[PDB]
Design a protein around this ligand. Structure first.
Ligand SMILES: *C/C=C(C)/C=C/C=C(C)/C=C/C1=C(C)CCCC1(C)C
Length: 133
């Protein structure tokens, strides 16, 4: 479907550490991030999204409009400037983040009550699955 609204609880996360290493997140921090439970809340109104991924001390938020490139500064992650763009490819929500890292971005597949999220950087893919609470 295209309706990603909801509160999404993590069911699985594969290759998180490889993806974080490809972004250059500090090794010591990685070993903390791997322990943290993540909650993903998405508010979607037309083209307008507000995405909030939260854990006890570490969050990632992004707000965007589909089809509108935006300057993103990943201040809580690797602290880089990218030019980000989120588009629909059929029912897949696709983000490409142009900048230093190649093949950087993410894709969301919504399948009923499930959300599949693939985060890419370089040659690494992290595959996550969430279920709608
Ligand atoms: C559509 C959903 C998206 C783009 C979710 C993105 C979430 C992240 C990039 C979360 C990253 C985090 C870490 C790399 C370390 C631990 C803290 C998190 C979960 C906020």
């Amino acid at each position: 479907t295209r309706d990603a609204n909801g509160t999404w609880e993590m069911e699985s996360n594969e290759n998180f550490e490889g993806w974080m290493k490809a972004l250059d997140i500090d090794f010591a921090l990685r070993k903390i991030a791997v322990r943290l439970t993540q909650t993903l809340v998405i508010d979607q109104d037309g083209d307008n999204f507000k995405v909030k991924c939260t854990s006890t001390f570490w969050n990632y938020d992004v707000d965007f409009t589909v089809g509108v490139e935006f300057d993103e500064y990943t201040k809580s992650l690797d602290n880089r400037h990218v030019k980000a763009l989120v588009t629909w490819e059929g029912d897949v929500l696709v983000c490409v983040q142009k900048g230093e890292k190649e093949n950087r971005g993410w894709k969301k597949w919504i399948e009923g009550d499930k959300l599949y999220l693939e985060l890419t950087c370089g040659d690494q893919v992290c595959r996550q699955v969430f279920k709608k609470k």
